[PDB]
Write a protein that holds these residues in place. Structure first.
Motif, mmCIF file in Angstrom:
data_model
loop_
_atom_site.group_PDB
_atom_site.id
_atom_site.type_symbol
_atom_site.label_atom_id
_atom_site.label_comp_id
_atom_site.label_asym_id
_atom_site.label_seq_id
_atom_site.Cartn_x
_atom_site.Cartn_y
_atom_site.Cartn_z
ATOM 1 N N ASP A 85 0.773 -1.249 0.000
ATOM 2 C CA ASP A 85 0.000 0.000 0.000
ATOM 3 C C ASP A 85 0.806 1.303 0.000
ATOM 4 O O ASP A 85 2.043 1.282 0.012
ATOM 5 N N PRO A 86 0.136 2.469 -0.080
ATOM 6 C CA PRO A 86 0.842 3.738 0.155
ATOM 7 C C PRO A 86 1.182 3.947 1.623
ATOM 8 O O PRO A 86 0.957 3.060 2.451
ATOM 9 N N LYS A 87 1.721 5.118 1.959
ATOM 10 C CA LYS A 87 2.141 5.427 3.318
ATOM 11 C C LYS A 87 1.531 6.751 3.757
ATOM 12 O O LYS A 87 1.434 7.693 2.965
ATOM 13 N N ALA A 88 1.121 6.814 5.022
ATOM 14 C CA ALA A 88 0.534 8.013 5.604
ATOM 15 C C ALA A 88 1.598 8.784 6.376
ATOM 16 O O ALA A 88 2.329 8.203 7.185
ATOM 17 N N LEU A 89 1.679 10.088 6.123
ATOM 18 C CA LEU A 89 2.626 10.967 6.795
ATOM 19 C C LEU A 89 1.866 12.123 7.426
ATOM 20 O O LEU A 89 1.071 12.787 6.754
ATOM 21 N N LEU A 90 2.108 12.358 8.714
ATOM 22 C CA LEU A 90 1.383 13.365 9.471
ATOM 23 C C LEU A 90 2.354 14.367 10.084
ATOM 24 O O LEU A 90 3.538 14.082 10.283
ATOM 25 N N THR A 91 1.829 15.554 10.375
ATOM 26 C CA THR A 91 2.567 16.608 11.053
ATOM 27 C C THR A 91 1.827 17.003 12.326
ATOM 28 O O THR A 91 0.618 16.793 12.456
#
Lengths: 49, 49
Positions: B21-27
């Protein structure tokens, strides 16, 4: 440019008595602009800095 | 010997185990300890309160 924060202030308070202390002045500001732009580009937070 | 047909076509369907899958990136917001101002002794005014 070998300038500290106090040395930068004393160069500001000169009646255009800048012979070649401008080289120290512009080098001090050049690095300062680099540091500020690096922080802005990385989007670093004020807490981390 | 290599499990091919007379024409060279393979006889076993292969598999590749699809990438994960894709990857989730958060701030996030970051906070640091902040202080307040101090108070000095006061002058005595010449005028009444």
């Amino acid at each position: 440019g070998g300038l500290d924060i106090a040395g930068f202030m004393t160069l500001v308070l000169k009646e255009s008595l800048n012979a070649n202390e401008t080289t120290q002045l512009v080098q001090f500001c050049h690095v300062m602009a680099q540091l500020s732009l690096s922080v802005q580009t990385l989007r670093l937070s004020e807490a981390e800095l | 010997r290599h499990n091919l047909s007379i024409d060279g076509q393979p006889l076993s369907l292969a598999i590749y185990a699809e990438p994960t899958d894709p990857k989730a990136l958060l701030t996030s917001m970051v906070q640091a300890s902040q202080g307040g101002s101090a108070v000095l002794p006061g002058t005595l005014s010449l005028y009444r309160f």
